[PDB]
């Protein structure tokens, strides 16, 4: 047989490259996943991740209370935190024993998989009572924030999209919903009558994941990297695996 | 009057038979319910049931954590179980005091009502981090498992459909979503523009039920039988009520 | 060992000690107890008996 | 065939009678069990039973502390009861918050199976520090109390032997051991060199049972009667099953 890495007859080499290219392209086909991640960063260094994976379109919607830090099997000032919530929903509404709850997110990172169309991204960043823009009556239910998404790149390939905003001020008390549509460069409308019921089933079939990791290191090591997910850490380092035309 | 059960003038008899036939046929009409049940079986003999009832289409989607046994108002090793989850999401990821959590499901039974079209059934059986097939990039978001569904029959009538799979191995750690579409032998597409917004409202109107029963006996006696639900027990016994053309 | 002695006991942890008394009552006599579970996960799933090579296998009794 | 209960050809009848006679006689053979039961009666009506079943010989030995009432999974004044023990071992030895502990037995019933030789029964009824007769130096380690055992009879057959003594006084604080030898009307000594090692193995193989029942009714219904055990209740009623030459 020919010697490895010396000719066009390195079929193991050609198959390895097609294996990777097929994974990348399958993800971008209409048969592929579109994924979103919401990272809620807490002052104790811990991170709540919410992931949703689904065909055609995907989104996450969380209340103000849902995004607050929750330590499973540990104490969480549960009564005082009810009182904190009352004071966030209306100024001087509660009877809490603290000025600032360390359970409030300090920042949010939204990440989409590379199969999303960035022009379809929408976000409903509401106040603590889940109103998008001060009062319902003058509220547009979303903002198309695609222009703000940074490309997460590895070896010159886009492995994801990231929108990051800090919540460092006392008044940064939010409810949050985000949505993205899978790329579709064809003229076959996935929601037209022929396929609309598959999109309705996709709403049933979407898989969700939620967990609080103790640190960004732990998130990078045990969540991001093992699953070949894209990520952008605090030092602006990009994580992911480049697959198109690669061995 | 004619004597009972001796002539074609037994109107009480004819009405009883139409009453049953009408119930069976209403369920199969586009005005009827389509229902799914997910049974998570635990080693202590207890069973978590998740039911969803809705028009046109229906589904259930649960995380790995959501399917774990939860004893309401009792102790549940809540801190150790956070640690178990960490070790299931990534090997050697946690610091648990147990090798196998008895809260993990030992088996899953999926049951659909007889108004489903078995060819529309889809299942997204993912790993513990809610990825359908090892990595997102090469994941088809579902599998059409209709061929594997067994007919639950009573008096020769199909009262439901059942897909059962055990999870007896240490590596059987899953996230699970299932979806089915109501039968529609007509050419009126329930999701075409005329009726699509009724299908969107059906997503709002779907009713969910969830409860942990202490034993299969208790499930059969107090959940299945009182509500005329179909079921298949561990001894392969079929439960349900035959209604078409019956008194 | 008694039936109770072979049941799982987690030292320094919770063990449903009251419910497990009730489990025992229902194992000693059918419908004898008032437990909140069908099967106790504390019951052994298997037993392995091992003897050293100095035993005479013909003298083993169980 | 002959008609039932009318001739010597009722083989079902003859086999039923041999079945019972064989059970009775097997128990009395050297291949059979010899059994002892110790019933500790508490003022709250509850009863601790200790049973031992073994070949050739059998006995039970309990400390003063071991015979005290223990409510599994409930509160038991565990610290005060340590203090009670100190005051029972030596007068004014402890710092308890009670004059009389309701955990102390109010009475003891010793019952042997009908396969025992009543002349071999021995009891070591010691004080609270496990000394049989005031001081070790003048203590015979047992008393042969066989003459005091009453025959438990059912249908004129001996189904067991009972020795009952109440402990109604403040000073009735005991440690207790009892032993009985299986009947052996032959001249084959079960402990002679030919069979001595089988007797040593019988010490390893003896099965023990211990449980606290809530009432004598409960003991009679769920312990005594289901297992065909002999018993004598507070109203002097005999329980057991007559088996010799019976259908
Ligand atoms: N600036 C400001 N924003 C408020 C206040 N109360 C509510 N908001 C909301 O908070 C959002 C702005 O938050 P930030 O961007 O963190 O505030 P900022 O003043 O721009 O401060 P920097 O972004 O850190 O420069 C707005 O879109 C408002 O909807 C307030 O008192 N001051
Ligand atoms: N067999 C196997 N499956 C694994 C392993 N790890 C994860 N899996 C997943 O588990 C699923 C198979 O589970 P099972 O069907 O219970 O395993 P099995 O080897 O077929 O064993 P049996 O069904 O009991 O005969 C696969 O579809 C994989 O996605 C593993 O180590 N061995
Ligand atoms: N009588 C008596 N027995 C004691 C005393 N202290 C210890 N004992 C022991 O208790 C045993 C006797 O107990 P009981 O038979 O209940 O006492 P009793 O005086 O005969 O009273 P009754 O049997 O109810 O008539 C004796 O064998 C002693 O070993 C004591 O102060 N008085
Ligand atoms: N929408 C897309 N989806 C998948 N790949 C894309 C997309 N747009 C561009 N690319 C490809 O990704 C690679 C990087 O192009 P990109 O435009 O991201 O890089 P750039 O021009 O160096 O940086 P930027 O545009 O961020 O300033 C190229 O191979 C490009 O063809
Ligand atoms: N898709 C359906 N929905 C409702 N009833 C059906 C459906 N298909 C068949 N039936 C009816 O249900 C009854 C049973 O038919 P079915 O095919 O289930 O039985 P079978 O041929 O004996 O067994 P099987 O097909 O499982 O080997 C018949 O009256 C049949 O007409
Ligand atoms: N040691 C024994 N073991 C088994 N059965 C015995 C024993 N001694 C006597 N029996 C038998 O048990 C039955 C009852 O005899 P037992 O002597 O117990 O009755 P009794 O003379 O009426 O009353 P008691 O002797 O108590 O005053 C008889 O069939 C007798 O042969
Ligand atoms: N603003 C507050 C906060 C707390 N408390 C009291 O302090 C007790 C303990 O506080 P809690 O907020 O419940 O915290 P933990 O019990 O420490 O934590 P968790 O409840 O999450 O286990 C509460 O029961 C509550 O009665 C209160 O009166 N007023
Ligand atoms: N891997 C583990 C498991 C438990 N623990 C400790 O043991 C205590 C009790 O265990 P937990 O898992 O909380 O179980 P329970 O309190 O018995 O039950 P629940 O919390 O569900 O009421 C916890 O607070 C935790 O500090 C621990 O340190 N490390
Ligand atoms: N069949 C049962 C089981 C439990 N309980 C009550 O629930 C309480 C807690 O249950 P228990 O069985 O004692 O478990 P834990 O306290 O969690 O564990 P342990 O006792 O082993 O520390 C008990 O005090 C008991 O009163 C009950 O009434 N009936
Ligand atoms: N003579 C005594 C008896 C009790 N106590 C105190 O009272 C507390 C509770 O009494 P205890 O005897 O332990 O009874 P419970 O806790 O009610 O029951 P248990 O310990 O059996 O669960 C103990 O911790 C002990 O410090 C004491 O100081 N002196
Ligand atoms: Cl495609
Ligand atoms: Cl219709
Ligand atoms: Cl013999
Ligand atoms: Mg706890
Ligand atoms: Mg609290
Ligand atoms: Mg307890
Ligand atoms: Mg105590």
From Swiss-Prot, chains A, B, D:
Keyword Signal annotated: yes
InterPro entries associated with the record: Cypo_polyhedrin_Cypovirus1
Glycosylation sites: 27, 76, 85, 236
Span of the signal peptide: 1-26
Gene Ontology cellular-component terms listed: host cell cytoplasm; viral occlusion body
Family matches, as Pfam families: Cypo_polyhedrin
Keywords: Glycoprotein, Host cytoplasm, Late protein, Signal, Viral occlusion body
Main location: host cell
Location in the cell: Host cytoplasm
Entry function: Major component of the virus occlusion bodies, which are large proteinaceous structures (polyhedra), that protect the virus from the outside environment for extended periods until they are ingested by insect larvae.
Miscellaneous field: The sequence of strain H is shown.
Protein name: Polyhedrin
Upper lineage: Viruses, Riboviria, Orthornavirae, Duplornaviricota, Resentoviricetes
